[PDB]
Amino acid sequence: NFPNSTNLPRNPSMADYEARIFTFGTWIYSVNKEQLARAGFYALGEGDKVKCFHCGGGLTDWKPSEDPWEQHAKWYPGCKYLLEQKGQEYINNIHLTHSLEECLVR
Numbered sequence: 001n002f003p004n005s006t007n008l009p010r011n012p013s014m015a016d017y018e019a020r021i022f023t024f025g026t027w028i029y030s031v032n033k034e035q036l037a038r039a040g041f042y043a044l045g046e047g048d049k050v051k052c053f054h055c056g057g058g059l060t061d062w063k064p065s066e067d068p069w070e071q072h073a074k075w076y077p078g079c080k081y082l083l084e085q086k087g088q089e090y091i092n093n094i095h096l097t098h099s100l101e102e103c104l105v106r
């Protein structure tokens with residue numbers, strides 16, 4: 001399933017922060033649910049699998065050191081919600097950071 005790069009959200013029923021927050025319930029996973037929701041994510045109920053309301057992008061297997069906004073930019077860089085909330089400069093930094101993180105050890 002291709003990522004949504006239009007200015008229109010794929011799941012408008014999940015456009016409000018509060019709506020997204022209800023999807024998690026009791027959340028045992030290593031990444032904060034408030035932080036996930038702020039980054040546009042809602043829970044699917046399949047372990048720690050989340051989806052962005054706007055781009056439709058799915059993310060799974062969260063480690064405690066990982067950041068929702070960073071991961072969002074890493075895997076769904078065409079997301080218009082992401083661009084709205086963070087700006088292109090932030091997004092550029094993240095890409096550069098990760099691409100460089102490769103030629104550090106990898």
Ligand SMILES: Brc1cnn(C2CC[NH2+]CC2)c1
Pocket residue numbers: 058059060061062063066071075
């Ligand atoms: Br595409 C995709 C699905 N999950 N992910 C990562 C999310 C953060 N944990 C490591 C995996 C990328």
Ligand SMILES: [Zn+2]
Pocket residue numbers: 040052053054055056057072076079080081082
């Ligand atoms: Zn998105």
